[PDB]
RNA sequence: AUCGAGAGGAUG
C-alpha cells in the first residue's frame, strides 16, 4: 500500500521471516542483508573480571564463552556508546554490570547456566540485559560444570556494539536468499553429464514462478525483480526489528553521507 | 563524413554450431548476383538465424576516433538504424588470389566476416569505421 | 674435433629432457675444458691446481 | 677488421635474405622516407644487443647449466629404452672425463 | 584351539595366503565377463590358484598407526599419503586427559576438538575418536578475489 | 606419541626401497621426509 | 668456505610468504613490525630536514619513525630514552636512521638461490598482519609457492648500493632470461585459467560490470570502447574489453594448426595495434613463452611498460573471474557409461595380447631379436603391451570429456596438470617400475606370498587395472607403494649430486668476464674465445627467426 | 549356526580381541 | 591443510559478509583453490568432502575405511535423495553484490587439520646487535636476535648481477669490517699499534 | 601482533574527512570521490541508483586493497550539471525507497498470526 | 571441550541444546539424525557442530584437587 | 656463552 518496494509475508514465527521482496532494484536487496548481518547494534559482555576460578576450564576460555550469550536488546538504541559516554571507563547508561557466582554445592555434578546470572547497575527502567532463554527446561545456554570444592567468580560488564567489530554482536544467524528458480536470466550456466534438469533440483520457490518454456527465445531486456527471502534471528532482538532496524541503519548510514557532503559546501565558500 | 558502404539480400545455407552456444558461424550466398559467398558470425540467442532464410546485409559507416560511446537514449536522438541486428567491427586485410574477384576480412571485436564479390573496388578502404546491420 | 664431441654430448644431455639452453653458454664451459691442451676435468684434478692463485 | 667481417656474417645472410629488391618492392611496399627508418632503426636496435664489458659471463654459464641440471632428476628414462645413459648420472661422467662410462656406442653410416 | 599361527617372513616363504576370506573360496558362476555385475565397482585379480594354507585377516592391516588416519588412502596417488603421514605428527589437540596437571616444557591444545565425519575402521583401536586433533570445517574449492 | 614408541631404525645394495617381504610387517607409507628417507621404518 | 666466502649478516629479515593479486609486480610487502626494525642511515640535507625533523620527533613506534641520531662528534644519540628525545634540533651533515618506508630498494632472494632471477630488487609496501606479500606472476623465478615456503630481504646502507640495486637488480630489467632466450616471469593459475575463459567467442559483457573493469585498469584512456555487438543490446567481447590492458604499436602472429584467418574453432592468435583480432588467450600468448606478448612487449616499449602489463592484465582477469566462478567436483573425474565398458573392454584385448605372447615363449617359438637375449625380447615385448594399453585408454577418456569440464577446462588453459594426469583418474593407471625393470621376485620366484611361483602375468608383476577414482586393489596399493617411494628415494639422496656439481661448475667458471677488448678471458688474461660465444652477442637481446633463403625450391628461389 | 564360516564384518571381532589383549606397545613391553 | 598432503597458509580472511552464499543461507568457514588438484592428483580429497556432507545430513558416520565396496556412485545415490546435487555442487551468490554465481561450486564438510607453524612464530629481523666471541660476526639463530646467513651460494647470485659495491658493504658495513696496521717490507700484521 | 584494530573499519582518525572530491584530469566533466571507513553495503547501492539517471555518462567503483576500509566512485555526467547534484539526487532517491519500504513492512508484520 | 555456544559458519546458538540432544536418545530411544530435526537443526552447517562433538569435559573433571 | 648429538620446514 505505497509507491516503492513490495514486501508480502507468507509464514513467519517468533523467530522466522518468509517474505518476496517485490520490486526493488538487486544493488538495493543485497546491501540490504550485508547490513543487516554486521551493522546493527547490540549489547553483549565485553569484559570480564575474574576473582576465583578453580575449574577445569582457564581463565579467557570462559571469557570467549560469555561474550557470545544472547543478551537482550531491545531499548538498546537510548544506550551511548561506551566510547562516547563522559564517564570514565564504564558507567550505567552506556553499560549494563552483570555478576556470576557458582560453587560445587553437593557431590553429584554442578551445571552452570546463564539464568545464574544477577543485573547490578540500575536499568533506569529500560528493557536491556535480561540473558536469552528459549530451553525448554527454563535454562539459559550453558557456560561450564563444577564438582566439589570449585569456586567461581565473575564480573560482566557488557557494551553497546556492531558485529563489524567481532561478531559476537550479531542479532543475525543465517539469512536465506535467492532470485529466480527457473533460470530465465541465464545468470548461471549449469554444469551436467545428461539432462540438466533431473540433474539438479528445483527449490520450493518454483511453485511460485511459471516454466520457462523451450519453444520461446530467450529474453535479452530482463532485470532482477522479486526475491525470495528468509531472516532468522538470534533472539536480542525480535525478528521483525532486524529488518526494521537494518532498513533504519541503512537509510541512517547513507544520509550521514548526503549530510557531510552538505558540510563541506558551506566551509570553503562561506568561511 | 557519412553514408552508406554496401548492400545486398543473402540465402543461408548452413548455420554451424561449433561447440558454442552463445554464437554461430553461418555460411549464406548472393542473389542474382551469381559468384558472391559470405561467411559470417552471428550471436543466435539474441537473433535467432535458422538455415534457408534471407537477411538484407548493408556495410556503411554513419553516425578524436571514438568519442566514449554514450549511452542510447534514442529516443530523442535520431538513429541510424531501421534494421533486427547490428554490429560495430574492423578490416584486417583483404585477400586477392587470382581473381577476377575480391575477398575482404572483418573482426566485430571477436566475430568474424569473409564477403566475396568484385564491384566493391571504391566501395570498402583499409580502414576502422566499420558497421553492418541486418533486417528481416 | 673433441671440442665438437663433448659440446654435442652436453647438449644431448640437457635437450634429451625438453630443455633448451643458449649456445653461448655450454659452448664457454666445453671450450674451458680444451684450451688447456687436452680435456681438462671439472675436479681438483681437471681444473685449478694449475699455477692459477693459490688463495683461490 | 677481419674477425669483425666474420662475426657478422650470419646476421647479414638474414639481412640481405629480407632487404632484397624483389621484396622492398612488393611483399611490404616501403616508401623513401619509411625506408631510412628501418634502416637507421635497425642499426641502433643492433648496438643495443652487443654484450657489455662488465657481464661476468663465467657465473652466467655455470648457473645457466645447473639449473636445468636441477630439474633433470625424474624418469629418467621410461619410446622407452635408451638404452644408453642420459640424466645426471651421464652429465656425472661428462664433466669428469670418465674413462669407464657405462655405456660407449659406435654409429656407422 | 588352532585358529591363528605368528608367521614371520622366512616362514613366510612357503605359503599361499588368500585375500578375501570370502570371495576367495566360495565356488564358480563365474562373473568376469558373465553378466551380471556393477560397473561402479572395482576390477580385482580374481583366485585362480585353489590350494591355499592361510589367509589374511583383514588388508587394511598393512598400513601404520599414523597412516590408518588417512580416509581412502587407496584413492590416493603413493607419495601423498606419506606426506599426512608425517603432518598428522604434528596437528594439534588433545595429547592426554591431564594436560592440566602435568608441567612439559610447551604443550598446544585445541579449544573445540572434533572426531571426524569420515573415520577408518582402525581408529577405532586407535582412539582417535575421544582425542582428535581437527575440525569438521565447511569447505569450498572455488577461485574467488585471488587471494 | 603413538606413532613414535613404534619406531625402527637402521645404520649408516639397495636398502631404502620398500622389499616386498615387508607385506604386513613394516607400513608402506608411513617413513620420514628427505634427510633419512626410507632407513627408518614405522611397525 | 663458511666464514669467509659466506658470512651472517645485519639489516636482514625473514617470514612466511603469500600471494596479492592486488600488488603491483615490483613490490613486496614488509609488515609494520619490520619495517619498524629496519634502518637506513641516511644524512640531514637541507632537501630532507622537514620530513626527518618530524620523524625523529614522530618517535620509535609510530611507522614513519626512527631510532638513533648520528652527530659531528661520532655519539649515538638512542630514542627510545634518553631525556633530549623530544627535543634535539637537527642541522646539516647529521645523520638519522628512518624506519624503511615505501618505494624502497629491498633484495629479496628465496634459497636455494641457484639463479641471478633468484635475488632481485623489489619495492617496499609496508602493511598490517605478518607476511611478506608478493606477485603472483614474480612467482616462476624464485619457484616460490604459498604452503609454508619463508623468503629472505636484505637492506642497503649506502647511495651507491642503492642505486646498484635497483638499476641491475631491479625486477622488471630481469623479465627476459639470459639463460634461453625467453622471459621467465609470466601469467600463472587463476589469471591464466580465467584470460582463457574471458576470450571465448561466447563470453559477452554488459554495461554495469563493463564500466567497473575500465575503472579497474590504471592509466585507463577514460574512453568507452564503441560496443562490439550494438543491436537490440549493447554488448562487449570478453577480448573486446582486455585489449585495453594492452599497450599501443604491439603486434602479434601465430597460427597453430587449422587456421584460415578466419579458425573453426579460434585456433591462432591475430594482435593488431592495441587491439586483438581473433583466437583464444592462453600459455602461448599470454604465457612466458619465446614469441609471447611478454616477449613482444618488453623488447618494444620496454621493462617498466611491461612491470606495469602485468598489474593491468591481472586487475581485469581477476575481477571478472571473482564474479563468474570456478571450480572443481568429482564429476569431473567421471566419464560416460558406454565408455566406462569400452575402457575395460581395451584392457582385458591387451590382457590377452599378453597371454599369447607368453602361451608362445613357453613352447620355445618366440624368436630371439639380433643381439638379446630370449628372455630379453619377452620383457620388452609385454612391457610395451601394457603401456600402450594405457594410452589408448587413456586418449579413450580425453575425447568423452566435455567442454564444460572443469578439469579439462584447466589443461586447455594450461594452469595446471597434462594429458596422463586425466587417463590415472579416470580411466587406468598403468605399470609400475623399479631400476628401470617391471616389478621384481622379492621372494622366491614369486611377488607376493599371493601368488604362486613363476607367474610372469600383469597383475603379478604389478600392473594397476584400476583408475584413482574406482580404487586401487590390496595387492595394486602395495605394489604402486614400491613404486612412488622411489621418488622421496632420490630427491633425498641423489639432489646431494646434483647441487655439488653446481658447485664444481661455478667455481671452474667463475671468474671468466669480458673485458674492453671484446675477448673472453679469466685471472691470467688467457683467452678462452676471441669474441664472447662467437660473436660478441648478449644472450638476451635475441630470438630465433627463419632464414628463408634455405628451405625452398631450386625454381622458387628465383621467384 | 556355528558352522557357516567367517565373512565381511566378522573379521573385525577378529582384530579388535586382539587389541583387547596386546594393546598397542606390547613388542616394547614384553 | 587437510587430510591428503594438501598443505597451505591462510591468505587472507573476510567476514560472512563478503563471503559467497549458498541460497541455504550457508557460509563457507574456508576456500581453497581448484588449481592444487589435478597436478598433485589426491582425489580421497575429493570424496570425504562428498561423503561427509551426506554424512552431517543424515546424522550419520562415515566409512572411509580404506579396501570397501564403497562407490562413488553409492554415495550420490544418497546425497541426490537428500535434495542435492549428486556430484557436490552447489549454487552459490557472490558477496560484494549478490549476483548469483554463473558456474556451480563444489563445496562441503571436510575435516581439517591445525598444524603447528605459526607466522608469528617464525617472523625475525635484525638491524645489529648479538655479536659473536670468536669471529666478531652476528650471532646465529632467532632466539638470540642475530643475523641471516650470505652464504657462497647467495654471493655467486650477486657477480652474476655484477653489482660490486653492494656485495662489499653485505662484507663490512654489516658484518665483519676491521682495522689492522702492516709492515712496508716483511707485510704481517707485528706493527705495534700505540695510537693517540 | 601486527593485526590493526577492528573498530578502524568505521571509525576515523586525526585529520581524516569522511569524503574526499577530486577532479578527474583524464575526462572533462567527470569527478573521483574517496568514501573513508566503506564498503560494498555503501559503494554498489550508490553505483546502480546512480545508474538510473539517463543524465549520467559514466559510473563505478574499486575498492582498492581489502586490508583497508575504503572505496573509490569515479562519475561523469551531461555538460552544464555538477556531479555532486548527481550523487544529492541519488542518495534522496535511496532513502525515499527505504522510508517507504520500512513503512510497507509494517502494514505486513501488524496482520501475521504467530 | 564443552559444547559451544552458536555454530561457526551460520550462528544459531547451539549451546543451550546439548543435554536435550542426549536426553532424546537414551530417554527417547533415537538415532542422532532425528535427534537433531527434533532440535531444530535444519541446516547442516549447524548439524556438525553437536554431530561431531566430543563431551572431554566429562573426563576433565575426573581429577581430584 | 662454547663443543657434541637428535626432530622438523622448503624443493618430492
Ligand atoms: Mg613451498
Ligand atoms: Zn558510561
Ligand atoms: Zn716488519
Ligand atoms: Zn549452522
Same mark, same amino acid.
Given at each position: ?7 508480502? #509475508? ?29 551493522? #546493527? ?86 528493557? #536491556? ?13 550453558? #557456560? ?128 | ?136 | ?56 | *677488421? ?23 618492392? *612488393? ?5 623513401? *622516407? ?10 641502433? *636496435? ?64 | ?147 | ?43 | ?559 | ?30 | ?196 | ?114 | ?65
Amino acid at each position: 500500500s505505497e509507491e516503492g518496494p513490495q514486501v508480502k #509475508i507468507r509464514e513467519a514465527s517468533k523467530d522466522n521471516v518468509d517474505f518476496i521482496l517485490s520490486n526493488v532494484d538487486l544493488a538495493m536487496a543485497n546491501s540490504l542483508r550485508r547490513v543487516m548481518i554486521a551493522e #546493527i547494534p547490540t549489547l553483549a559482555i565485553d569484559s570480564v573480571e575474574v576473582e576465583t576460578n578453580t575449574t577445569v576450564l582457564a581463565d579467557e576460555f570462559i571469557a570467549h564463552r560469555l561474550g557470545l550469550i544472547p543478551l537482550q536488546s531491545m531499548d538498546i538504541e537510548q544506550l551511548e556508546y561506551s566510547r562516547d559516554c563522559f564517564c570514565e571507563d564504564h558507567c550505567d547508561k552506556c553499560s549494563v554490570v552483570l555478576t556470576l557466582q557458582a560453587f560445587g554445592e553437593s557431590e553429584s555434578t554442578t551445571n552452570v547456566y546463564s539464568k545464574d546470572l544477577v543485573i547490578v547497575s540500575n536499568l533506569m527502567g529500560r528493557n #536491556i540485559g535480561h540473558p536469552i532463554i528459549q530451553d525448554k527446561e527454563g535454562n539459559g545456554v550453558l #557456560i561450564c560444570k563444577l564438582r566439589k570444592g570449585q569456586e567461581l567468580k565473575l564480573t560482566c560488564v557488557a557494551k553497546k556494539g556492531i558485529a563489524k567489530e567481532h561478531a559476537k554482536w550479531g542479532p543475525a544467524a543465517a539469512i536465506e536468499f535467492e532470485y529466480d528458480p527457473w533460470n530465465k536470466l541465464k545468470h548461471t550456466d549449469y554444469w551436467y553429464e545428461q539432462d540438466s534438469a533431473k540433474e539438479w533440483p528445483q527449490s520450493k520457490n518454483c511453485e511460485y514462478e511459471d516454466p520457462p518454456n523451450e519453444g520461446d527465445p530467450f529474453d535479452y531486456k530482463a532485470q532482477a525483480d522479486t526475491f525470495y527471502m528468509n531472516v532468522e534471528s538470534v533472539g536480542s532482538i525480535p525478528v521483525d526489528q532486524v529488518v526494521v532496524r537494518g532498513i533504519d541503519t541503512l537509510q541512517k548510514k547513507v544520509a550521514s553521507i548526503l549530510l557531510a557532503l552538505t558540510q563541506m559546501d558551506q566551509d570553503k565558500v562561506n568561511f | 563524413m557519412s553514408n552508406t558502404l554496401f548492400d545486398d539480400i543473402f540465402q543461408v545455407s548452413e548455420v554451424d554450431p561449433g561447440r558454442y552456444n552463445k554464437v554461430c558461424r553461418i555460411e549464406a550466398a548472393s542473389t542474382t548476383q551469381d559468384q558472391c559467398k559470405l561467411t559470417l558470425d552471428i550471436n543466435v540467442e539474441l537473433f535467432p538465424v535458422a538455415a534457408q532464410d534471407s537477411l538484407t546485409v548493408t556495410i556503411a559507416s554513419s553516425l578524436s576516433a571514438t568519442r566514449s560511446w554514450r549511452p542510447p537514449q534514442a529516443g530523442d536522438r535520431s538513429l541510424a538504424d531501421d534494421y533486427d541486428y547490428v554490429m560495430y567491427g574492423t578490416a584486417y586485410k583483404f585477400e586477392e588470389v587470382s581473381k577476377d574477384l575480391i575477398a575482404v576480412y572483418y573482426s566485430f571485436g571477436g566475430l568474424l566476416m569473409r564477403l566475396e564479390g568484385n564491384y566493391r573496388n571504391l566501395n570498402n578502404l583499409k580502414q576502422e569505421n566499420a558497421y553492418l546491420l541486418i533486417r528481416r | 674435433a673433441g671440442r665438437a664431441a663433448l659440446y654435442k654430448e652436453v647438449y644431448n644431455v640437457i635437450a634429451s629432457d625438453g630443455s633448451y639452453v643458449n649456445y653461448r653458454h655450454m659452448a664457454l664451459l666445453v671450450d674451458v675444458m680444451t684450451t688447456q691442451g687436452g680435456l681438462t676435468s671439472v675436479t681438483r684434478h681437471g681444473f685449478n691446481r694449475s699455477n692459477t692463485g693459490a688463495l683461490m | *677488421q677481419n674477425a669483425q667481417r666474420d662475426a657478422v656474417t650470419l646476421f647479414c645472410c638474414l639481412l640481405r635474405s629480407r632487404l632484397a629488391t624483389r621484396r622492398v618492392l *612488393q611483399e611490404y611496399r616501403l616508401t623513401k *622516407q619509411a625506408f631510412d627508418w628501418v634502416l637507421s632503426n635497425i642499426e641502433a *636496435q643492433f648496438l643495443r644487443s652487443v654484450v657489455h664489458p662488465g657481464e661476468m659471463v663465467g657465473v652466467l654459464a655455470a648457473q645457466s647449466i645447473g639449473e636445468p641440471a636441477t630439474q633433470m632428476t625424474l624418469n629418467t628414462f621410461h619410446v622407452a629404452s635408451k638404452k644408453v645413459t642420459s640424466g645426471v648420472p651421464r652429465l656425472k661422467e661428462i664433466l669428469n672425463v670418465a674413462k669407464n662410462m657405462k655405456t660407449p656406442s659406435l654409429t656407422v653410416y | 584351539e588352532g585358529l591363528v599361527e605368528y608367521i614371520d617372513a622366512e616362514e613366510e616363504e612357503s605359503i599361499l595366503i588368500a585375500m578375501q576370506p570370502e570371495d576367495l573360496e566360495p565356488a564358480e558362476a563365474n562373473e568376469e565377463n558373465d553378466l551380471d555385475v556393477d560397473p561402479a565397482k572395482r576390477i580385482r585379480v580374481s583366485h585362480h590358484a585353489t590350494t591355499f594354507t592361510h589367509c589374511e585377516i583383514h588388508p587394511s592391516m598393512i598400513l601404520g598407526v599414523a597412516a590408518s588416519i588417512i580416509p581412502f588412502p587407496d584413492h590416493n596417488q603413493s607419495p601423498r599419503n606419506t606426506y599426512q603421514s608425517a603432518m598428522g605428527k604434528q596437528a594439534m589437540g588433545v595429547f592426554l586427559t591431564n594436560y592440566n596437571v602435568r608441567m612439559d616444557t610447551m604443550a598446544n591444545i585445541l579449544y573445540y576438538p572434533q572426531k571426524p565425519l569420515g573415520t577408518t575402521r582402525a581408529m577405532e583401536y586407535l582412539k582417535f575418536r575421544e582425542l582428535p586433533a581437527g575440525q569438521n570445517a565447511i569447505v569450498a574449492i572455488a577461485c574467488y578475489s585471488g587471494y | 606419541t603413538l606413532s613414535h614408541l613404534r619406531r625402527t631404525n637402521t645404520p649408516i645394495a639397495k636398502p631404502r626401497q620398500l622389499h616386498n617381504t615387508h607385506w604386513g610387517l613394516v607400513c608402506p607409507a608411513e617413513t620420514p621426509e628427505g634427510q633419512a628417507c626410507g632407513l627408518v621404518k614405522n611397525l | 668456505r663458511g666464514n669467509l666466502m659466506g658470512k651472517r649478516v645485519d639489516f636482514s629479515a625473514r617470514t612466511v610468504i603469500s600471494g596479492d593479486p592486488n600488488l603491483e609486480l615490483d613490490q613486496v610487502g614488509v609488515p609494520k613490525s619490520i619495517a619498524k626494525t629496519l634502518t637506513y642511515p641516511e644524512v640531514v640535507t637541507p632537501y630532507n630536514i622537514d620530513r626527518l625533523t618530524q620523524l625523529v620527533r614522530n618517535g620509535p613506534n609510530e611507522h614513519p619513525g626512527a631510532k638513533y641520531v648520528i652527530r659531528d662528534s661520532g655519539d649515538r644519540i638512542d630514542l627510545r630514552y634518553s631525556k633530549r628525545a623530544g627535543d634535539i634540533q637537527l642541522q646539516y651533515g647529521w645523520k638519522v636512521e628512518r624506519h624503511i618506508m615505501d618505494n624502497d630498494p629491498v633484495l629479496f632472494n628465496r634459497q636455494p638461490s641457484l639463479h641471478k632471477m633468484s635475488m632481485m630488487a623489489h619495492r617496499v609496501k609496508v602493511i598490517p598482519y605478518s607476511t611478506f606479500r608478493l606477485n603472483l606472476s614474480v612467482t616462476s623465478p624464485y619457484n616460490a609457492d604459498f604452503d609454508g615456503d619463508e623468503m629472505n630481504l636484505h637492506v642497503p646502507q649506502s647511495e651507491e648500493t642503492r642505486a646498484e640495486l635497483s638499476q641491475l637488480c631491479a625486477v622488471p630489467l630481469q623479465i627476459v632470461s639470459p639463460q634461453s632466450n625467453k622471459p621467465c616471469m609470466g601469467i600463472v593459475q587463476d589469471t591464466l585459467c580465467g584470460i582463457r575463459k574471458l576470450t571465448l567467442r561466447d563470453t559477452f559483457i554488459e554495461l554495469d560490470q563493463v564500466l567497473n573493469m575500465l575503472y579497474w585498469v590504471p592509466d585507463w584512456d577514460g574512453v568507452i570502447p564503441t560496443p562490439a555487438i550494438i543491436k537490440p543490446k549493447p554488448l562487449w567481447s570478453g577480448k573486446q574489453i582486455l585489449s585495453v590492458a594492452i599497450p599501443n604499436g604491439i603486434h602479434l602472429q601465430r597460427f597453430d594448426e587449422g587456421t584460415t584467418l578466419l579458425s573453426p574453432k579460434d585456433n591462432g592468435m591475430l594482435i593488431i595495434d592495441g587491439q586483438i583480432i581473433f583466437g583464444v588467450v592462453e600459455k602461448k600468448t599470454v604465457g612466458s613463452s619465446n614469441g609471447g606478448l611478454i616477449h613482444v612487449v618488453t623488447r618494444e616499449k620496454g621493462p617498466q611498460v611491461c612491470a606495469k602489463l602485468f598489474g593491468n592484465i591481472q586487475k581485469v582477469v581477476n575481477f571478472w573471474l571473482l564474479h563468474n566462478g570456478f571450480s572443481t567436483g568429482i564429476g569431473d573425474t567421471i566419464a560416460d557409461g558406454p565408455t566406462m565398458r569400452e575402457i575395460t573392454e581395451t584392457i582385458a584385448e591387451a590382457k590377452k595380447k599378453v597371454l599369447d605372447v607368453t602361451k608362445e615363449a613357453q613352447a620355445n617359438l618366440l624368436t630371439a631379436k639380433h643381439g638379446m637375449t630370449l628372455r630379453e625380447s619377452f620383457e620388452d615385448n609385454v612391457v610395451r603391451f601394457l603401456n600402450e594399453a594405457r594410452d589408448k585408454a587413456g586418449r579413450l577418456a580425453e575425447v568423452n570429456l566435455k567442454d564444460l569440464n572443469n578439469v579439462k577446462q584447466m589443461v586447455m588453459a594450461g594452469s595446471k596438470g597434462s594429458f596422463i594426469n586425466i587417463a590415472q583418474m579416470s580411466a587406468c593407471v598403468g605399470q609400475q617400475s623399479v631400476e628401470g625393470k617391471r616389478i621384481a621376485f622379492g621372494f622366491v620366484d614369486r611377488t607376493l606370498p599371493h601368488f604362486s611361483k613363476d607367474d610372469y602375468s600383469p597383475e603379478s608383476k604389478g600392473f594397476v587395472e584400476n583408475s584413482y577414482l574406482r580404487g586401487l586393489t590390496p595387492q595394486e596399493f602395495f605394489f604402486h607403494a614400491m613404486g612412488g617411494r622411489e621418488g622421496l628415494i632420490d630427491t633425498a639422496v641423489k639432489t646431494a649430486e646434483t647441487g655439488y656439481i653446481q658447485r664444481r661448475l661455478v667455481k671452474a667458471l667463475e671468474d671468466i668476464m669480458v673485458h674492453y677488448d671484446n675477448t673472453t678471458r679469466n685471472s691470467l688474461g688467457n683467452v678462452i674465445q676471441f669474441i664472447y660465444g662467437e660473436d660478441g652477442m648478449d644472450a638476451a637481446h635475441i630470438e630465433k627467426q627463419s632464414l628463408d633463403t634455405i628451405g625452398g625450391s631450386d625454381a622458387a628461389f628465383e621467384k | 549356526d556355528e558352522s557357516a564360516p567367517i565373512t565381511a564384518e566378522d573379521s573385525w571381532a577378529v582384530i579388535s580381541a586382539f587389541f583387547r589383549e596386546k594393546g598397542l606397545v606390547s613388542q616394547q613391553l614384553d | 591443510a587437510s587430510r591428503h598432503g594438501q598443505k597451505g597458509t591462510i591468505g587472507i580472511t573476510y567476514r560472512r559478509e563478503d563471503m559467497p552464499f549458498t541460497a541455504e543461507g550457508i557460509v563457507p568457514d574456508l576456500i581453497i583453490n581448484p588449481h592444487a588438484i589435478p597436478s598433485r592428483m589426491t582425489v580421497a580429497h575429493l570424496i570425504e568432502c562428498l561423503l561427509s556432507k551426506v554424512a552431517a545430513l543424515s546424522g550419520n558416520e562415515g566409512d572411509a575405511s580404506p579396501f570397501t565396496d564403497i562407490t562413488v556412485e553409492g554415495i550420490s545415490k544418497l546425497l541426490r535423495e537428500h535434495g542435492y546435487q549428486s556430484r557436490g555442487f552447489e549454487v552459490m551468490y557472490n558477496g560484494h553484490t549478490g549476483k548469483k554465481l554463473m558456474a556451480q561450486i563444489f563445496f562441503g564438510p571436510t575435516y581439517y587439520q591445525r598444524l603447528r607453524h605459526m607466522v608469528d612464530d617464525k617472523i625475525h629481523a635484525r638491524a645489529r646487535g648479538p655479536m659473536q666471541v670468536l669471529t666478531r660476526q652476528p650471532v646465529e639463530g632467532r632466539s638470540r636476535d642475530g643475523g641471516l646467513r650470505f652464504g657462497e651460494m647467495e654471493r655467486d647470485c650477486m657477480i652474476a648481477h655484477g653489482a660490486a659495491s653492494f656485495l662489499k658493504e653485505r662484507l663490512m658495513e654489516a658484518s665483519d669490517a676491521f682495522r689492522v696496521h702492516i709492515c712496508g717490507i716483511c707485510g704481517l700484521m707485528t706493527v705495534i699499534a700505540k695510537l693517540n | 601482533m601486527n593485526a590493526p584494530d577492528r573498530f578502524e573499519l568505521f571509525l576515523l582518525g586525526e585529520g581524516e574527512s569522511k569524503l574526499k572530491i577530486d577532479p578527474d584530469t583524464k575526462a572533462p566533466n567527470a569527478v573521483v570521490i574517496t568514501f573513508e571507513k566503506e564498503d560494498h553495503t555503501l559503494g554498489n547501492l550508490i553505483r546502480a541508483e546512480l545508474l538510473n539517471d539517463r543524465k549520467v555518462l559514466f559510473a563505478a567503483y574499486k575498492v582498492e586493497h581489502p586490508f583497508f576500509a575504503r572505496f573509490k566512485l569515479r562519475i561523469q555526467t551531461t555538460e552544464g550539471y555538477d556531479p555532486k547534484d548527481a550523487l544529492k539526487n541519488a542518495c534522496n532517491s535511496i532513502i525515499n525507497k527505504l522510508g517507504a519500504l520500512k513503512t510497507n513492512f509494517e502494514t505486513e508484520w501488524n496482520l501475521q498470526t504467530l | 571441550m564443552i559444547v559451544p555456544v552458536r555454530c561457526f559458519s551460520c550462528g544459531k546458538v547451539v549451546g543451550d541444546k546439548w543435554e536435550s540432544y542426549l536426553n532424546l536418545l537414551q530417554e527417547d530411544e533415537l538415532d542422532e539424525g532425528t535427534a537433531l530435526s527434533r532440535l531444530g537443526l535444519k541446516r547442516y552447517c549447524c548439524r556438525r557442530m553437536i554431530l561431531t562433538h566430543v563431551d572431554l569435559i566429562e573426563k576433565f573433571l575426573r581429577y581430584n584437587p
